[PDB]
Ligand binder design. Structure first.
Ligand SMILES: [Ca+2]
Ligand SMILES: [Ca+2]
Ligand SMILES: [Ca+2]
Ligand SMILES: [Ca+2]
Lengths: 654, 654
């Protein structure tokens, strides 16, 4: 097991001595401001190793960070022992350390004229047992995820927390999905209902989980604490309505107006990518269904090639408009900025993941006769390419309902197998192609890319969409994903260890933008599922009332289930919210104890009512100093006897 | 201006001396336990006047109440001056006083074997200027509502706060409603969209307002503080997960199961009342449209008579099932119990308010030919009643599309005019029929019923439903309500003063159950409006795609607008939530100041990095006591020069 003695590593690119020297000078000048540097240079770029010297001055800042998080309400419990030494009963976590030191480097004490990167080194001793402990287990445990947070951070930890929770909830649709396939058959108006019921439950349950995890890990509300973006544009400067600190203000409603440009942007993505996909699909239909002679197997690959060339090209242009629009929307924090870019990308992701299926389930199978003009375009076009005047041989366009079954098999089986290769084997091959002890190891790790949680997030989010929307045409889809996800936990853990450098510890109290993505896919999947069932069941397909009622009932079934599930979960106890609400109580309680001598939160004796008589006496006397207003027959019994006397008097009248 | 010197009044019914005497004895025995009693008896029932004697012992309990509200998080700011006398810079409010002693009277220190009632006396001096100041103003102000809370309480105050906000938001549909009527015409697929847009805005805006009002009045979360119901059934006893106090527990999910019986209950109400209303409507059609000879004007009243007899009779039975089901659901607090009974009643209210219109807009006008079997039933039935064998004269059933216009005129004009009479003139007539100074006045006031906020709440809530659902067939409806609501503010204030006794000060942080009612009416009104537009426009009415597309677009327009409005409002500042989040900050800040000497929330000088060198020296020495692991070239410049030396060395290779 190889060891490490470094906290962070800073490589400074060496182009020309003039600026490279200046870079090395002041970067050193600043780093030594608070942290030790040992600078050994390898691979034509100098490597500045940085670690905290004084542990006394470090824990003084770690504790100061604990206070900051607690002050703004991010941390549930204060470190109010007030002595930093004895406060290490809650010891400094490696992620907590690595994060806080990263800040000292990356706070406004740096970022420095094209520094190559800043990254911590891995822990081979930890990564070994990591992939080992998980490859032996059939079932992961919460403490395993807690360990992930400890060494890497909540940003990485939540994904595994999400993937794990999504994995076990995926058992349910694997159950009645197998049962639907085994008994009920394809296109069942029952699996769709159970799929909608499931999607609502899993989503609402995970939202409830995120609060608990945020409280457990003490990151609840960390999103509005992180450093604001440098290139954030602000019109004026005011006071924080909470903290009172000088915050730079930019009109929220002015941002809302700018964010309205996502509506035409989204349509542009649906049109651009959609036209690209529906075109390749028409070729796929023309080449296979409509014959076109020898070389068909050679020709069959050609439309697939168009996708590979077309997708990054068209979406790359659209991404430029996204990145440009993202800056215009002007986000205060790095958290909000990257979360908005991801949402913009989701429209691109949606198209390149489902449009092939939409074309099949809503255009191809239920109608298909509208594809004839598309087919003729390829008929004439291919004739030109042939160069020979003779017509390409042709046969009647016949609709094959097995198309939706073949595509679903790809996305659920074949596409997931080539995923394991692309996500793991291809990066590992790159290492093989590349092919003191610290330095060689550090050379290696310097090369790798930073781990991106977003890539792993969408792979599962887009996968969920397949279940929510198109699994009614292939009920065995959930089972294929269930198997994949077990390996996905292992595989993603494996690539973090050896295929990428250790990511900077970063904190979030939610999966973020992916929540809306899941929620949208779940809703649209209620319309999609039922609509597919009606159209693909194959009486004449009466689009008028037949299609719309199927959608009307299933969508409203989804909406009612939504209200039902939330209602039930709202009456269940929530550990996360209970902790925060209890600390707040006791904190308020403590001040009361200190201020009032422990005695607050009995009833006076009857004899005290004589003191009551005394106060009435004192009132009368003060009024006696000075008409009907002050009348009292004082004493307990005097009133009783008068009232008693009244009782027999009133019956005397009767 | 007549004055008062009493806080509360307790009349004890006198039937037979044995129990009436026992009632008078111990009720007195208990009342004097903490409060003064003067007992003068009038109108065959003894009147026990109760007021607080010791003002020193009273403010000691008022302040203790302030602490209680603040401790549980209901109050934003503590009364932490700790001296009750100087804490009257926030003086004791009359409602605050009256509420707290009502508790003193009615907590488990009473309720006492059929005590007639317990109620405070009005303030004629205040009620005079009340109706005066509002009858002079064109526009009410927040401070006017604040005054209402002061003398009556938040329960009464919220209604007027709701009515006022609902009144001014009702200006908007009065605007484009007049415009739709003036220009666009009836059944416009544009007013409906603006109606849905408006309903979402007003509702979401009011929800935001309730938080602010709750914070302003310091009642935020008071619902889970009030005394639990005596007849609440509890299985076991545990500790409050927050307070730690012994709370009696009843399984929430066991209640959820019991609450599932509202689904068949609702259907029973829709069927029972629905059958009753659709029957009277068939008579209305038979008597007017289908002639039936002389006495038609006399006969015309007969179906209306059926409604007046039928409605309280059928719904009275259904209410018994509601009251029975309500107890089974077993609610912990009186707040939750009455809120659930109101929700059950809403189904009855919904039917008796809109079913006549549904019959017109969905059965009568767009079809009507399905009414022929209903008409024949009355044809034969009337023949039997006539006693003469000769057939009743008959004429062709002809559909009149002006029916929906006539009914809408009733509900918006005529029904609101007879409302002013029933809600104000009829109670005032009752006083005229009824026709020392303390005695005369208190005798009069004892008779009056307790003010019910629920009655005034539904009148406006059911009115809102007319706008949200059926105003597209009568766009001038909002204007008629706008005029009514201005008077409604005045009139309801007038009946509280003279038509009813002063209500006990009671606190809530929301309008409660009416929120869901408004939200449901707003949603259903999106389907109702568009469906009405399509069906009542009057090509053949293709129910299949035509009706459903109209609903599909308008409902989804509603759902998207919902997300849009919430998104916008979520980026606006909320005064209520800002106060609570700031106190929590400063409270946490204060403890930090006390504990750490005011100094927490600069950067060390470069020379300190020599102390950094010192700590590295201390590390080495301790390791020196004891291979590649501990390597350092100490000092700022030693690292710089080595790195510098590396620079020209690496270029030498090149
Ligand atoms: Ca994979
Ligand atoms: Ca992955
Ligand atoms: Ca009225
Ligand atoms: Ca009213």
């Amino acid at each position: 097991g190889v060891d490490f003695v470094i906290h962070y590593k800073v490589p400074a690119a060496e182009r020309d001595e003039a600026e490279a020297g200046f870079v090395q000078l002041i970067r050193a000048l600043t780093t030594v401001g608070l942290a030790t540097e040992v600078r050994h240079g390898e691979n034509e770029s100098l490597l500045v190793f940085v670690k905290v010297a004084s542990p006394d001055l470090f824990a003084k800042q770690v504790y100061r960070a604990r206070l900051g998080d607690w002050l703004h309400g991010v941390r549930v419990s204060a470190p109010h022992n007030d002595i930093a030494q004895a406060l290490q009963d809650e010891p400094v976590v490696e992620a907590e350390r690595l994060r806080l030191i990263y800040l000292m480097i990356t706070k406004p004490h740096n970022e420095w004229k094209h520094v190559e990167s800043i990254f911590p080194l891995h822990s081979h001793s930890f990564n070994k047992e990591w992939i080992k402990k998980w490859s032996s287990k059939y079932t992961l445990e919460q403490t395993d995820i807690d360990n992930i947070r400890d060494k890497f951070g909540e940003s990485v930890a939540f994904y595994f927390a999400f993937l794990r929770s999504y994995f076990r909830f995926l058992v349910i649709p694997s159950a009645f999905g197998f049962g639907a396939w085994l008994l009920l058959g394809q296109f069942s108006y029952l699996y769709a209902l159970l799929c909608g019921l499931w999607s609502v439950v899993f989503f609402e349950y995970w939202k409830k989980q995120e609060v608990d995890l945020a409280v457990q890990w003490g990151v609840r509300g960390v999103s509005s604490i992180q450093q604001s973006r440098p290139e954030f544009e602000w019109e004026h400067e005011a006071e924080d309505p909470i903290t009172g600190e000088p915050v730079k203000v930019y009109p929220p409603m002015k941002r809302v107006k700018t964010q309205l440009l996502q509506i035409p942007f989204a349509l542009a993505c649906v049109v651009a990518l959609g036209a690209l996909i529906v075109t390749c699909n028409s070729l796929e239909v023309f080449i296979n269904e409509v014959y076109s002679g020898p070389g068909k197997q050679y020709l069959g690959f050609l439309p697939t090639i168009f996708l590979v060339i077309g997708t990054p090209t068209i979406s790359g242009v659209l991404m430029g408009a996204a990145e440009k629009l993202n800056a215009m929307e002007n986000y205060a924090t790095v958290d909000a900025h990257d979360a908005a870019l991801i949402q913009k990308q989701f429209v691109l992701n949606f198209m390149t993941s489902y449009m092939a299926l939409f074309f099949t389930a809503f255009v191809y199978i239920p109608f298909g006769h509208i594809l004839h003009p598309f087919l003729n375009f390829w008929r004439a076009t291919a004739q030109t390419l042939t160069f020979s005047e003779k017509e390409l041989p042709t046969r009647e366009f016949q609709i094959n309902p097995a198309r939706i079954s073949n595509q679903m098999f790809y996305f659920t089986v074949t596409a997931q197998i080539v995923n394991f290769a692309t996500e793991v084997v291809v990066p590992y091959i790159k290492q093989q192609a590349f092919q003191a002890e610290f330095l060689q190891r550090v050379r290696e790790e310097c090369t790798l890319e930073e781990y991106d949680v977003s890539g792993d997030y969408r792979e599962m989010v887009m996968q969920f969409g397949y279940v929510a929307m198109f699994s009614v045409a292939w009920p065995l889809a959930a089972c294929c994903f269930l198997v994949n996800n077990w390996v996905e936990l292992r595989s993603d853990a494996l690539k973090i260890a050896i295929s990428s450098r250790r990511p900077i510890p970063w904190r979030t109290d939610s999966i973020g933008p992916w929540l809306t993505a899941l929620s949208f896919l779940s809703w649209l999947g209620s319309i999609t599922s039922s609509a597919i069932v009606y159209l693909c069941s194959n009486a004449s397909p009466l689009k008028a009332w037949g299609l719309l009622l199927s959608i009307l009932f299933a969508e409203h079934f989804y909406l009612v289930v939504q209200l039902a599930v939330r209602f039930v979960l709202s009456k269940l106890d929530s550990p996360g919210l209970q902790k925060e609400r209890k600390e707040r109580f006791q904190t308020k309680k403590r001040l009361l104890q200190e201020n009032l001598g422990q005695d607050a939160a009995a009833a006076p004796g009857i004899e005290h009512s004589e003191k009551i008589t005394r106060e009435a006496l004192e009132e009368e006397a003060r009024q006696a100093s000075i008409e009907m207003f002050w009348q009292r027959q004082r004493g307990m019994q005097e009133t009783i006897e008068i009232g008693r006397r009244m009782i027999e008097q009133q019956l005397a009248a009767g």
